[PDB]
Nucleic acid binder design. Sequence first.
RNA 1: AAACUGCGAAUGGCUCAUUAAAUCAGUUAUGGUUCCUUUGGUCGCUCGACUUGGAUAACUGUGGUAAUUCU
RNA 2: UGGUGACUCUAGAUAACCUCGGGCCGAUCGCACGCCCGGCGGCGACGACCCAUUCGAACGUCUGCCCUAUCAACUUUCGAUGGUAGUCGCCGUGCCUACCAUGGUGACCACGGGUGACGGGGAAUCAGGGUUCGAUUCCGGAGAGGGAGCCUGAGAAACGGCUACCACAUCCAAGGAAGGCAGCAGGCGCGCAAAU
RNA 3: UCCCCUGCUCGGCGCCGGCCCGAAGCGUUUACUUUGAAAAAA
Lengths: 262, 185, 37, 124
Amino acid sequence: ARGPKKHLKRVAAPKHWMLDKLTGVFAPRPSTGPHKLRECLPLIIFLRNRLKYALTGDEVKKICMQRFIKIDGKVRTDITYPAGFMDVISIDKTGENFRLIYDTKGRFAVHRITPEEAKYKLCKVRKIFVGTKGIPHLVTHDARTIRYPDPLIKVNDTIQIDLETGKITDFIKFDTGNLCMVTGGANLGRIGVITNRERHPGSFDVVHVKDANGNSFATRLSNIFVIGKGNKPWISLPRGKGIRLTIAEERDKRLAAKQSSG
Amino acid sequence: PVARSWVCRKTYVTPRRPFEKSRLDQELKLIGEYGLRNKREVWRVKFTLAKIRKAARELLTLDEKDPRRLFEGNALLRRLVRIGVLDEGKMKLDYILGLKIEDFLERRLQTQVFKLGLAKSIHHARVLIRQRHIRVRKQVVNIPSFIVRLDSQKHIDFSLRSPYGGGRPGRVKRKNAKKGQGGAG
Amino acid sequence: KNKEEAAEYAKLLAKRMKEAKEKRQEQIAKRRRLSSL
Amino acid sequence: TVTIRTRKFMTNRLLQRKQMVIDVLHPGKATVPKTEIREKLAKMYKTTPDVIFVFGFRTHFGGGKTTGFGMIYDSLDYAKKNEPKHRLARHGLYEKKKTSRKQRKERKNRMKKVRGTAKANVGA
RNA sequence: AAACUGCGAAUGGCUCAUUAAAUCAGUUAUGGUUCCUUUGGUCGCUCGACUUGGAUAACUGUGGUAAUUCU
RNA sequence: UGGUGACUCUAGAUAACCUCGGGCCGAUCGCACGCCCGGCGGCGACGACCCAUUCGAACGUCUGCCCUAUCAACUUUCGAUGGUAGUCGCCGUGCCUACCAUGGUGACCACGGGUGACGGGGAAUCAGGGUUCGAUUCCGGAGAGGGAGCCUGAGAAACGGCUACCACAUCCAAGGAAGGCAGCAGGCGCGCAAAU
RNA sequence: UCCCCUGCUCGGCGCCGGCCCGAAGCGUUUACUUUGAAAAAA
């Protein structure tokens, strides 16, 4: 091409956006934001296909001009604003808050939270930057630049920010034996405990996470996310508690629920 | 670029030998016995049973105590029991290969109407299905190639808007009644 | 904001440097203990 | 003798509207028009029959069932704001300009033909 | 309305002519560069007027060429 | 001070520089209003030298391309190979200059030629192995008759932007003026062959 | 079916400088065999 790409087709969309195949030729390309193009959830698809509040793409922009949707506590008038992982969506009119946590399968899922849980948000730092006259800086995974943290913050460990002031309350050290979230790739949405970490110089490092039922799997170091100290989390888990049960056990529990329901 | 489907496939297969006596007689006997229209329908049923047998042989090729073999075998076995051509006593994967095409032709709607007792002959059953006189669970069917399930065999009955099952009289009866009232007054 | 926030980083950096210095003092005290035993 | 049942009923305070999937039962009769459907939805919701909007009624094979959608508002102006204009034209409350696209495009090129205040004059 | 200004017009649409380690495909690197817009930071950190200048559009009037989205 | 498996990394100090075809350090706008003795304040919009993030783009690493020997050796002071110092480029680099040594690839098929060759995800056929096609809606590359050059702009060698040539071609008081449907319809030509 | 026939600088399931276990770091390289990661959708 001669410049940046601007349109997006239906089947060029990622599967976790997870639309149909015959309603149009184009899919909503998100605007530029804190998250990547692939792993993000736009506001238009969320309001049109998850809560079923609106049916048509003009109704959601009418909502956004009505100033009822806030992402991370600030009113967002952008219709294709990318709301990615670990984000809080607050609606002032109806009075409910939503937090985007991956469920047991590789897709975003709704999670109704209390307002007392809706004042904080976790972040993963990408790199540590020292400023002009020795200012310690932050590079989070949500493009938030924070000045002067606690001096124990490292490359991999996660932080907690307060939404109103943008400052660190408490942090979780990345050690073997802490609770885990996986974001990306095949193993996406599994709750486990970090057990072993191996260093590969010149290439990507791989970790090993053991689930609560004894299942173990490996993910890359760049796709890791710590949510809790020990086995106790800091947020509210969705339904299923991140197990990735097999399709035979899923068939068994589905047929048991269908037989019990009648 | 237009937003269509572009997905379709054939449901019947043409045999390699066009003219020999025995298979022609066997297909012609099946067409006459079950009152079908042409050879394409029995070729379609043979194609479906061939695909089911190929899937069963592919599952029986894979060794015991595997997750996907047990999963697909139980799924195909449950579907083949629920369609009505198997029994719960014969709940095994190695009995799929012993099936014949007449068992698949038994669960057709035309022969089910003929065997239930709602029509005189099987051709009368077919021209009853094409006529929209019956229903399957408060919903009419017009297509004679309506495969039924084990729980759906009991619920078949005449439709509401039909003179056979109680309703408005047809066109010829109303025409004859109008002719009688014209001749009487 | 710049002045006050530099003041809490001054206090936190002083406390962390004091903790690191006393930890290193305990480390060399343990080193002298193992060298003397 | 026709009956109406409700399904997937939910309200939107942020759209000041109520949304549901209605089920229409008309056995032994043709498809009922939307005005009687609107008057019945006005009856069972205790609402005036002016903010009642229904659309998309597809008839099943055999007769007796027809699945449609209904839209319930609170007031007239809040209904008039967040509405597609074709349903307002079906209700008769909106009128669109009656000209076709070819003469609009040709008239736009005639405004492209000249420059100044006469651009409005050449388009008549 | 018209017009000055900033923006987008480098997206989309059509075709397969050139091209045989070229294109492309999987795996990698920019610790060897650029990056509109969006998001977040910085915007009294420097030791020396309670608002400045004249030009142009649109507009009015006078014109040319046989002819241009010409002047 | 801080980090990486690894700096001539970030940071610290010193001595200067800082380009008038010239880095920043708000001569902008809307709404609702105010407290305290002229000074003192809220919620936004637009712009901004930088820093990270985002959409990318670009140049590289390893591996994988149809047929042909009636193509056996190929390239090189007209750069082919490497070194050094530079120009230029947004950066690495024979990309290109000045000087050096004679190098680099190949019987493991280089080189040359042909292609009725866009590549791939794919399609047909199919016991198992295979054979043929892939212009075609998704991804990437290329072009708007063919080469060449350029402005603006962050991003184009853009063609529904400009400029030079030839082939073709419109109007014309003969002086000049105006163009590129391999976009949607449609016409001619072509051909077994393809729509308002 | 299952436990056993790889060795020298730091530290926790445990005791009274002695026992063992665990680790920042090392052990001839290839093919092949098995598992794990990443490998766009249709």
